[PDB]
């Protein structure tokens, strides 16, 4: 009956399902290492600067 | 020259989208919390283009040159305003009576936590709040202990601890300042806000993990009352408050509490509309046109 | 033709900002509300320089055309799906019994309010909703009437009645259509939120005015419970929950 979804409402929703999960770092790591490599790629791909201006 | 900025904006948005991308599934299908610390990487990556790796139309840059500077200056103010408040706030506190301490300890000894953070009382602000400085300060009004049989102490106290544990109040400050210099890309503000929601969710988990289920129900009910009693605040961006945040629901509650019984004399609308209209007429007097007219 | 795009956007934003100043100040300092109807005039203004009445670029122009076309098509699709959702709800509704009618009568007895709008019930949804069609339909859960002591009925009825009185639902319908077509100026979409925000506030003012001071807190408590104990849905985003 609330006008629209917001924070108080979201919190109450989560209160209904116990988060009985072992949220192992395994997953975050997989993403984090992937992510980092992509920034590496971004670098080879593109850089520039004004230091060139002889 | 500002071509660099454009490059910067693009890089930022790239990583930004990447994180947002993953999140959906991780919660939607697996109910995982994403450990928010990952977000610092967006900033880093976004700024890589500034490194001199080495391995007319530009009038606009003559201008963008100072847009940067001005924004920083304004933000310097914004930031400091809050910081100064914190100066003020901190110095007004006091330590506590043993009996309260005994109660407090009874609640929390179970954790036997790393007590290198601090508990103190207040004679000022209505709701308990927290911020960092270098000490991890938890501050709560005296009315709550004088009301020794309030019971809700059981839950309120723990909540604050939960913010203390991940050092939310530390990161927040740093993050803010750093972002201020890179004032150029509004997406960073999305992030500035977004991060908050996660912190609060985690805090709720934290609490539930320390109580019964019968109690869960009770707790949830107590939160609602904790929202009810007062107007909210935005006093310290460099802090976390208790009443959740600026919102529609809250605004409506505030108004219903206040008297609201009067008509404004009709002219106000009669004229505001006339006014608006004449001006658009004027706008038109000079401005109109479309390509079909171009024989 | 880029020029026309630009003009339309600019014109709209000009007035838009003007209006915002007024509302803020007027409420902030003198405690008054403005009747939201004025907002239609922003759409109008935005389309004046637009009509062909005077009283490199090639690429830019070509693409702009294409985007306009697609935006309208997809928003319409979204809108239409919702529209039949509404059809569904109507089909499934039913009238109430005599005593239930008698309860309504009591609540509205001294109100003697216009009866050219309709009150009906269904088991389909956990909380009441309303919509327009042309008949002003108020729908409540069929599970509520039997509760001899809910003391919700009183408040729920006035709340909705009040919404019905101002024909707010109609305005949203048409209003949305115009933004469906003029899909590109983000400001045009944004104003929708403002309309809703106030529409509900105003409704509350109405209700409070019809109840005892001693129960003001009662009303408020129910408002909270109405949220606390329920899941959220927005299938009909064109309607009020
Ligand atoms: C600049 C704005 C300033 C105003 C802010 C002031 C207001 C401050 C706002 C702060 C509070 C947040 C309120 C929440 C509102 C909201 O809808 O924003 C949500 C993001 O939605 C988007 O994906 C869209 C968000 C982006 C907004 C624009 C909409 C368009 C999106 C399409 C972009 C995708 C295309 C990619 C290419 C981008 C390159 C340009 C919030 O994220 P989350 O809660 O994690 O949801 C998870 C979701 O289930 C997971 O699905
Ligand atoms: C891209 C070109 C744009 C050209 C225009 C120049 C501006 C560019 C700079 C952009 C960022 C500035 C951010 C400030 C926004 C101005 C609004 C502004 O001044 O509004 C501020 C606030 C609060 O309104 P208030 O003053 O209390 O009066 C409300 C009154 O009762 C009733 O009135 O809006 C919200 O936070 C509610 C937003 C709800 C809408 C839904 C979500 C999307 C977020 C809205 C944001 C929408 C996103 C913005 C997109 C235009
Ligand atoms: Zn918190
Ligand atoms: Zn309503």
Numbering used by the authors:
A (entry chain C): 284 to 337
B (entry chain B): 1 to 55, 98 to 337
C (entry chain A): 1 to 55, 98 to 283
Study text:
BlaR1 and MecR1 are membrane proteins with an N-terminal zinc metalloprotease domain and a C-terminal extracellular β-lactam-binding sensor domain. β-Lactam binding to the extracellular BlaR1 sensor domain regulates BlaI cleavage by the zinc metalloprotease domain in the cytoplasm. BlaR1 forms a domain-swapped dimer, with the zinc metalloprotease active site accessible from the cytoplasm. BlaR1 undergoes spontaneous autocleavage in cis between Ser283 and Phe284 and we describe the catalytic mechanism and specificity underlying the self and BlaI cleavage.
An asymmetric homodimer class was identified, resulting in a reconstruction of the previously uncharacterized BlaR1(WT) transmembrane and zinc metalloprotease region to 3.8 Å with a local resolution extending to about 3.3 Å. Dimerization defines a central cavity, which in the native membrane is presumably filled with lipids. Densities consistent with phosphatidylglycerol headgroups are observed lining the electropositive surface formed at the base of the cavity. The loop connecting helices α8 and swapped α9, housing the scissile bond between residues Ser283 and Phe284 (residues 271 to 289; here termed the autocleavage loop), enters the zinc metalloprotease active site of its own chain, directly demonstrating that autocleavage occurs in cis. The initial zinc metalloprotease substrate, the autocleavage loop captured here in uncleaved and cleaved states, provides insights into the molecular details of substrate specificity. The P4–P1′ residues of the autocleavage loop (Leu280, Ser281, His282, Ser283, Phe284) adopt the typical β-strand conformation of protease substrates, which runs anti-parallel to β3 of the gluzincin domain β-sheet analogous to substrate binding in thermolysin related proteases. In addition to main-chain β-strand hydrogen bonds between Thr172 and His282, the substrate is anchored by hydrophobic interactions of Leu280 into the S4 pocket at one end and P1′ Phe284 inserting into the S1′ subsite at the other, with the intervening P2 His282 within the S2 pocket the other important specificity determinant. In the WT structure, one chain shows clear separation of Ser283(P1) and Phe284(P1′) supporting a post-autocleavage state. By contrast, the density in the alternate chain is more uninterrupted, suggesting a pre-cleavage state, consistent with a population of both uncleaved and cleaved protein in the sample used for cryo-EM. The autocleavage loop is in the approximate position for cleavage, with the P1 Ser283 carbonyl orientated favourably towards the catalytic zinc, which canonically acts to polarize the scissile bond, promoting its electrophilicity and subsequent nucleophilic attack by an activated water to promote cleavage.
